């Protein structure tokens, strides 16, 4: 804060008016100029095909299995359930040490499941064991804030985002700390690993998201296009874009190579915030779980609502499309999971 | 249906049976959230302790009081997890009038919360032992930091102690009626009816919520 703050505060801004100028220079189109002639997806409708009941408290997270069949639901009752979407069977019911859990993830191999909440610890569970039950494999402590999103990189490394303004990557075998991604100025809420699993994005409560290099360790770029907290994030299937779901009643998407905001996806009649987002199979449909007990389906190219997913009497907190894009697994605070089409 | 599928269905049925069994136990107890300031001494508010949670039962009904710790001074996102508790215990000590302004601003922020619009608060004014010895001498009065702390009704100690309660009830009834109501009490370090006051407040809270749920209020 010395003479290098009447100097290096402007020089901390010189690279902001010379970045927005660089940013606003490479913009010869908006999304709705080359996606105007494409006919709309129509009034996309989707009825519920399987209602996975059984939870008591409100649902906070839900992750799809890689096999497009199993899924794991996290609720504030201290229970973790692995489902069989085809038959609505309950494969497992894993009790939790901490009754407050806000994260859940499925390992890509299907051998593990992670959870974490206000305990500031990611507990990773072993599904397939010779013992015949589900027991903790590791107790990933060393993080101060409450966990907000866990995602499995491989069978041995996991990426977590917490409320202490730090995204941060572990190694399950050692349980120690490999890389700590810092730079956010607020509670990080969401996480979305890239399909190539060499980068990821995270949205905090500072109206900004940062694309991190998981291999290297530093933020490649920061994306500021909102005005409130970002409590939802999801990655485009092609790996070159992603969407931000914020609580300011709008959900923007960004392009990694363009380093800009493409569309807003906002409606005047919608006032409630967004909780979760996901692209279905090709990025044309952007599922978005809102706060007014609904989940709009957005034609991403046209920025028009294609359908609604009403059927939850409480706010929708979970939203996830399956690997083959055959169904959705929206879950809400009414302790009810639902599968659509 | 295959035999293996039949056995899987039976295993699932057992899973739901065991899950439902725990629901009765979860619903029997009552959930409380403890919060306040660092100097409030929230831990010694409940002198019988028996996320730092405690499990105390008075009149043979169990309460689980959760003291959130380690989190920063935001409470913006992890407070959107407790909108099912019976009440929130906001403990503030009145040992210093320099921080009572910050305390009442914090109470205004937490009372006028979108996710906490239908949940009530029980106000515990901790550390009433030294309020007398801070007002009996009068070497530093509340009117130094406030405009009109010059009228309220030892007599002097009580007239000094009811002004903060007047301010807090003014804040509470400023916005939000019926759904949630503050419960201003007076707690000491050596006071013994702290859990009793909590119980006597939450029974009335449950009564009010049942009145609204039967549509009688």
């Amino acid at each position: 804060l010395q003479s290098e703050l009447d100097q290096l505060r402007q020089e901390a801004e010189q690279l902001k008016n010379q970045i927005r100028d660089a940013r606003k220079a490479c913009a010869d189109a908006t999304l709705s100029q080359i996606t105007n002639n494409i006919d709309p997806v129509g009034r996309i409708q989707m009825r519920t095909r399987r209602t996975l009941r059984g939870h008591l408290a409100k649902i906070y997270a839900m992750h799809w299995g890689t096999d497009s069949r199993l899924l794991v639901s996290a609720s504030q009752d201290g229970k973790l359930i692995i489902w069989d979407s085809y038959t609505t069977n309950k494969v497992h019911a894993i009790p939790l040490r901490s009754s407050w859990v806000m994260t859940c993830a499925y390992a890509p191999s299907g051998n593990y499941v992670a959870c974490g909440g206000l305990d500031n610890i990611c507990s990773i569970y072993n599904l397939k064991t010779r013992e015949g039950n589900v027991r903790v494999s590791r107790e990933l402590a060393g993080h101060t804030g409450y966990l907000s999103c866990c995602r499995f990189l491989d069978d041995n490394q996991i990426v977590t985002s917490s409320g202490d303004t730090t995204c941060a990557l572990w190694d399950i075998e050692t349980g120690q700390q490999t890389t700590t991604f810092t730079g956010h100025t607020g509670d990080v809420m969401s996480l979305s690993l890239a399909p190539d699993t060499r980068l990821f994005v995270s949205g905090a409560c500072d109206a900004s998201a940062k694309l991190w290099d998981v291999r290297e360790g530093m933020c490649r770029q920061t994306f500021t296009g909102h005005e409130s907290d970002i409590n939802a994030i999801c990655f485009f299937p092609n790996g070159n874009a992603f969407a931000t779901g914020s609580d300011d009643a709008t959900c923007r998407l960004f392009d990694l190579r363009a380093d800009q905001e493409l569309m807003t996806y906002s409606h005047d009649n919608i006032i409630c915030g967004i909780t979760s987002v996901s692209f279905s199979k090709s990025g044309r449909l952007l599922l978005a779980g809102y706060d007014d007990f609904n989940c709009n389906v957005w034609d991403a190219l046209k920025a028009d609502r294609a359908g609604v997913l009403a059927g939850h009497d409480n706010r929708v907190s979970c939203l996830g499309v399956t690997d083959d894009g055959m169904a959705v697994a929206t879950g809400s605070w009414d302790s009810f999971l639902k599968i659509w089409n | 249906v295959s035999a293996e599928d039949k056995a899987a269905a039976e295993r699932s049925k057992m899973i739901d049976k065991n899950l439902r069994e725990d629901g009765e136990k979860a619903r029997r107890t009552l959930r409380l959230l403890l919060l306040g300031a660092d100097n409030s001494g929230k831990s010694t508010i409940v002198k019988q302790m028996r996320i730092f949670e405690t499990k105390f039962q008075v009149d043979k009904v169990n309460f689980h009081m959760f003291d959130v710790g380690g989190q920063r001074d935001e409470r913006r996102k992890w407070i959107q997890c407790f909108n099912d508790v019976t009440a929130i215990i906001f403990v503030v000590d009145s040992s210093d009038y320099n921080r009572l302004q910050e305390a009442l601003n914090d109470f205004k922020s937490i009372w006028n919360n979108r996710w906490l619009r239908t949940i009530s608060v029980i106000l515990f004014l901790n550390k009433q032992d030294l309020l007398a010895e801070k007002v009996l001498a009068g070497k530093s009065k509340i009117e130094d930091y406030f405009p009109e702390f010059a009228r309220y009704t030892d007599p002097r100690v009580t007239r000094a102690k009811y002004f903060i309660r007047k301010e807090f009830v003014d804040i509470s009834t400023a916005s939000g009626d019926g759904r949630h109501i503050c419960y201003p009490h007076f707690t000491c370090a050596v006071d013994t009816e702290n859990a009793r006051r909590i119980f006597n407040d939450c029974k009335d809270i449950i009564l009010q919520m049942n009145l609204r749920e039967y549509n009688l209020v």
Partner: single-chain antibody, 229 residues
Framework: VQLVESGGGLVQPGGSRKLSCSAS????????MHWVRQAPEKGLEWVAY????????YYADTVKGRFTISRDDPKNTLFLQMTSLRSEDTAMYYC??????????????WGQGTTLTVDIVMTQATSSVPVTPGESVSISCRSS???????????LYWFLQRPGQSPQLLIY???NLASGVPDRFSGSGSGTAFTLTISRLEAEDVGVYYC?????????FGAGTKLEL
């Protein structure tokens, strides 16, 4: 994980015998236990079944009413009551653990069997093949009905029985593999006829394999395909 049972011996016909299994080292209450008999030199014949908890009991036809199955969860104990010791009762009985959820591997673990002396037909036409070590083998089994169920998985199980060893799981539910089983093992086939094509077999593979179905709960056993030289 360690399963054991005791109560063998010699029985004068017309008597009762309490055969009990002492499970240890796993979540007993979350496993559907079984019982599988084997005559001294004939082949395995599944006899009974108990589900997780105290659900369905699925005695075999040849012993229905004559044998009773019981379990004691909190002490981790399993039983097999026997009445009226018969001429064909002389066999070695095994207790095999299995769990049924999506992706689980039933019949994964077996206990060392105790000897107590006195209808989908599945045939393994070859009961003895001298297979040169190091090259390959193509053990085959066939059924009478199509094991391909509507959900898309055939319910054939393969096992291995070395001399002086309890049966061990092998490629199960057509082309799936169990834990502790080398990747060289493989097997595929259609309904009504299956194969066990192995790649680069080595020593410690000589034994009598078995082919059992799991579509209808009477679980018939194949003749066996024991190898040699």
């Amino acid at each position: 994980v360690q399963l054991v049972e005791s109560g063998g011996g010699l029985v004068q016909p017309g008597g009762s015998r309490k055969l009990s299994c002492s499970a240890s080292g796993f979540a007993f209450s979350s496993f559907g236990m079984h019982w599988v008999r084997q005559a001294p030199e004939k082949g395995l014949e599944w006899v009974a079944y108990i589900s997780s908890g105290s659900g369905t009991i699925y005695y075999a036809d040849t012993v229905k009413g004559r044998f009773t199955i019981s379990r004691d969860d909190p002490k981790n104990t399993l039983f097999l009551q026997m009445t009226s010791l018969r001429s064909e009762d002389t066999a070695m009985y095994y207790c095999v653990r299995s769990i049924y959820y999506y992706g689980s591997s039933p019949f994964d673990f077996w206990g060392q069997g105790t000897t107590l002396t006195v209808d989908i037909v599945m045939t393994q036409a070859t009961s003895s093949v001298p297979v040169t070590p190091g090259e390959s083998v193509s053990i085959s089994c066939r059924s009478s009905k199509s094991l391909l169920h509507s959900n898309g998985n055939t319910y054939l199980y393969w096992f291995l029985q070395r001399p002086g060893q309890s049966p061990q799981l092998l490629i199960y539910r057509m082309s799936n593999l169990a834990s502790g089983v080398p990747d060289r093992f493989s097997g595929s086939g259609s309904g009504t006829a299956f194969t066990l094509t192995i790649s680069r077999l080595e020593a410690e593979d000589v034994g009598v394999y078995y082919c059992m179905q799991h579509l209808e709960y009477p679980l018939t056993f194949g003749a066996g395909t024991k190898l040699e030289l």
